[PDB]
Design a protein around this ligand. Structure first.
Ligand code: CNC
Ligand SMILES: [Ca+2]
Ligand SMILES: [Ca+2]
Ligand SMILES: [Ca+2]
Lengths: 121, 81, 381
C-alpha cells in the first residue's frame, strides 16, 4: 500500500527527535528503506537508509541521526540528535527493491511517503 | 598470483572470493573451491519453516526452491505431508 | 510467409565486431555488459580466451553485489546476466544460483503490485525478466504473465518486440498453460503492431528497433516483403555506419548469424566462430539549448569536429553556467539531471536536433555537425 511518517514536531536546537516510518504492505526482508528531507526552497536530499539484507549516512548527518528497525513493528526509526537550524524540513521515508548490497542515498526510490513536518527554531 | 582476499582455482587460474570457498557450489571449473574442503509475513504470503524469509503463496510448489531450505517445494505431489 | 537476412561476406560482420572488441577488456562493474557477452556467443564472431575472463567478471560482480557494493547491478541487468549463462550452455544453478532467480522473481512481483498504474522500470524490463526466467525453465505465476498480456497506452517497437520474445518462450516451453490461448493472441498482435510501425525507409520504427523486431519476427511464421524491406533498410544503414553503440551491435549480431534470444533454449556453444582481431584539425560550433527551464539556456559551444554531444556538455560545464548529471547504463551515459533539475517519475530528459526531431542515439554516440542545435528537453512519458 504506502508508508506513513510521524514523530515530527517543534523543538529547539540541541534537542532530540524520533521520526517513525511505519510500512504497511511490504514484505519484511526485501526492500531498502530510506529517509529523505526537503527544506523549503531546496532539492530533496538523501539523509539515511537501512539495508535490505547495513547502514549509509550522508556525512552532513554523520554521528547525528541514526536509523534502526523495530522487530515487532516493521517500522524504521530515524533518531535525531544534536539538532541545528538547517535540519529543519519535512521528512519523507521511501521504499525500493534493490537487493544490491547497500541502500542508496540518491533520490531514486519507488514508493514514497507523505512526509512529516519537523521544524526547529 | 591472486590478491589476498580471493582463492585462485587450481586449473583455470582464475580468482574467486573466499565466500565461495566451501559453500557447496562449484564455482571453479574443476571444483577446487569445494574439494580439500571441511517480524511477520503478510496475508497471501508464507514463511519458510527454517528461515525467516517470506515468499508469496504462489511460489509454493512452482518448480523452484524459493526458500534456502527448499521447504516451499517439499510437500508437492501429495496432500499435506 | 518468411523472414530472411541473406548471407554476407565476413568483412561487414568483421568491422561490426571490431567495435565490440575494446569493451572485452573493461571489466569494472561500471562497464560490464552481459548483453555484449550474449551477442558475441550468438554471433559468427568470437574473442577467444577473453570471453572466459569476461564471463568470469560478470559471475564475480553480479553474484557478489547481489548476494553479499557500489550500487546495482539492476534487476533488468540481472535478467541479461541469466541470458549470458544460457549463452555459455549453463542453467542458473546451485545455492547462489537459486537465490538470484528468487530475486528476479521478486522484481517481477514488486512490479506486478505497482501496476495494480505503471511499472517502476519499464514493460521492456518486465518482459525481459520473464524471458530470462523462461530460458532457465523457471516458471512465473499466471498473474505475473497477465501484466505483460494486458500491456498489448502506446509502446515502442522494442517494447512489443521484447514482449513478443517473452511470450514466444512461454509458448515453446508450454509454460503458463492457464493462458495458452492468450499468449498466442498476444504473439499474433505483437506481430501485427511491429509491421504497422514500418517506416517508409523500411525500418520497424527506427534502425535500432529493427534488430530486435527481426529477432522476434524470425521466430514465428507483409511478412517476407516487410522483411526484405527491413534487410535493405538495415543494410544501407550499416554501410552508412549507423551501428556504433556496443549494446546495439550486440542486439544486431545474433540476427546477422540467424539467431535470436529464443535460441538460448537450446544453446550451441560449439559452432565455430571467426576470431576477432583489434586526429582532425577542425573546430566546429554547436549550439546547445534547454527550453524546459526558465529562463531558457541557449549557447554556442566550440569543440573539435567529431566530438559527441557528451563532449559538448562537458565543455559547456567547463566554460561556466551549465550543469548536468549522467548515470551509467548498459548503453553508455544516460542523462539524468540538467541544470539541477532531475527527471522525475515517468519523466526523462530527451535529446533532439533541429527541427524538433528526437535523436536516435545518446549523448556519447551522437556526433553533431558544425552548426547543429542540440536540445535537452524534460518530457513526460
Ligand atoms: C523505455 C526505454 C527504451 N529506449 Co530509450 C527509448 N525509446 N529509453 C528507455 C527509457 C528509460 C527509462 C526506463 N524506465 O526504462 C526512456 C524512454 C526514458 C529512455 C530515454 C530515450 N531512449 C532513446 C533511444 C533512441 C535509446 N533508448 C533505447 C535503450 C530504448 C530501449 C529499447 C532497446 N532496444 O533496448 C527501451 C525500450 C528500454 C531500455 C531498457 O530497459 N534496456 C534493458 C536494461 C536491462 O538495460 P539498462 O541499460 O540498464 O536500461 C537502462 C538504459 O537502457 C537506460 N537508457 C534507456 N535509453 C537509453 C539510451 C541511451 C542512449 C543510453 C546511453 C541509456 C539509455 O534506461 C534503462 C534503465 O532505466 C535504445 C534502443 C532505443 C531505440 N529503439 O532506439 C535508444 C538508443 C539507440 C542507440 N543507438 O544507442 C534515447 C535517446 C532517446 C532520446 N532522443 O532522448 C532517450 C535517452 C536520452 C537520455 N536521457 O540520455
Ligand atoms: Ca540494497
Ligand atoms: Ca564454491
Ligand atoms: Ca518455490
Amino acid at each position: 500500500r504506502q508508508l506513513v511518517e510521524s514523530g515530527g514536531g517543534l523543538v529547539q536546537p540541541g534537542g532530540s527527535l524520533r521520526l517513525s516510518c511505519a510500512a504497511s504492505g511490504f514484505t519484511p526482508g526485501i526492500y531498502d528503506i530510506g529517509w529523505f528531507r526537503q527544506a523549503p526552497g531546496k532539492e530533496r536530499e538523501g539523509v539515511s537508509c537501512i539495508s535490505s539484507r547495513s547502514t549509509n549516512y550522508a556525512d552532513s548527518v554523520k554521528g547525528r541521526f541514526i536509523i534502526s528497525r523495530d522487530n515487532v513493528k516493521n517500522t524504521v526509526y530515524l533518531q535525531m540528535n544534536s539538532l541545528e537550524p538547517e535540519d529543519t524540513a519535512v521528512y519523507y521515508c521511501a521504499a525500493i527493491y534493490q537487493p544490491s548490497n547497500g541502500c542508496v542515498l540518491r533520490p531514486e526510490y519507488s514508493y514514497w511517503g507523505k512526509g512529516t513536518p519537523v521544524t526547529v527554531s | 598470483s591472486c590478491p589476498p582476499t580471493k582463492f585462485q582455482c587450481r586449473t583455470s587460474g582464475l580468482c574467486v572470493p573466499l565466500t565461495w570457498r566451501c559453500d557447496r557450489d562449484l564455482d571453479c571449473s574443476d571444483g577446487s573451491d569445494e574439494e580439500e574442503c571441511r517480524l511477520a509475513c503478510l496475508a497471501g504470503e508464507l514463511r519458510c519453516t527454517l528461515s525467516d524469509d517470506c515468499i508469496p503463496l504462489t511460489w509454493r510448489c512452482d518448480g523452484h526452491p524459493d526458500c534456502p531450505d527448499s521447504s516451499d517445494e517439499l510437500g508437492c505431489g501429495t496432500n499435506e505431508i | 510467409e518468411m523472414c530472411e537476412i541473406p548471407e554476407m561476406d565476413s568483412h561487414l560482420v568483421e568491422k561490426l565486431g571490431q567495435h565490440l572488441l575494446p569493451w572485452m577488456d573493461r571489466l569494472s562493474l561500471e562497464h560490464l555488459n552481459p548483453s555484449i557477452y550474449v551477442g558475441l556467443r550468438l554471433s559468427s564472431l568470437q574473442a577467444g580466451t577473453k570471453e572466459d575472463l569476461y564471463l568470469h567478471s560478470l559471475k564475480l560482480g553480479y553474484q557478489q553485489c547481489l548476494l553479499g557494493c557500489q550500487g546495482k547491478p539492476s534487476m533488468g541487468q540481472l535478467a541479461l546476466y541469466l541470458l549470458a549463462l544460457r549463452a555459455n550452455c549453463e542453467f542458473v544453478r546451485g545455492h547462489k544460483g537459486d537465490r538470484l532467480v528468487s530475486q528476479l522473481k521478486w522484481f517481477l512481483e514488486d512490479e506486478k503490485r505497482a501496476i495494480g498504474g505503471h511499472p517502476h522500470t519499464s514493460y521492456y524490463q518486465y518482459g525481459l525478466g520473464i524471458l530470462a526466467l523462461c530460458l532457465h525453465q523457471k516458471r512465473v505465476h499466471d498473474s505475473v504473465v497477465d501484466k505483460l498480456l494486458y500491456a498489448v497506452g502506446h509502446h515502442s517497437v522494442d517494447t512489443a518486440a521484447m514482449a513478443g520474445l517473452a511470450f514466444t518462450c512461454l509458448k515453446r516451453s508450454n509454460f503458463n498453460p492457464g493462458r495458452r490461448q492468450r499468449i498466442t493472441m498476444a504473439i499474433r498482435t505483437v506481430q501485427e503492431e511491429i509491421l504497422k510501425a514500418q517506416t517508409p525507409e523500411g525500418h520497424f520504427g527506427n534502425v535500432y528497433s529493427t534488430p530486435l523486431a527481426l529477432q522476434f519476427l524470425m521466430t514465428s511464421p507483409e511478412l517476407g516483403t516487410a522483411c526484405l524491406k527491413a534487410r535493405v533498410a538495415l543494410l544501407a544503414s550499416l554501410q552508412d555506419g549507423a551501428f556504433q553503440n556496443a549494446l546495439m551491435i550486440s542486439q544486431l549480431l545474433p540476427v546477422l548469424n540467424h539467431k535470436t534470444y529464443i535460441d538460448l533454449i537450446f544453446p550451441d556453444c560449439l559452432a565455430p566462430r571467426v576470431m576477432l582481431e583489434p586526429q582532425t584539425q577542425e573546430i566546429i560550433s554547436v549550439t546547445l539549448q534547454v527550453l524546459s527551464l526558465l529562463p531558457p539556456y541557449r549557447q554556442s559551444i566550440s569543440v573539435l569536429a567529431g566530438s559527441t554531444v557528451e563532449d559538448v556538455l562537458k565543455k559547456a560545464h567547463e566554460l561556466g553556467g551549465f550543469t548536468y548529471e549522467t548515470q551509467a547504463s548498459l548503453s553508455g551515459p544516460y542523462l539524468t539531471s540538467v541544470m539541477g533539475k532531475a527527471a522525475g517519475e515517468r519523466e526523462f530528459w530527451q535529446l533532439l536536433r533541429d527541427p524538433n526531431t528526437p535523436l536516435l542515439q545518446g549523448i556519447a554516440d551522437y556526433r553533431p555537425k558544425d552548426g547543429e542545435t542540440i536540445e535537452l528537453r524534460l518530457v513526460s512519458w
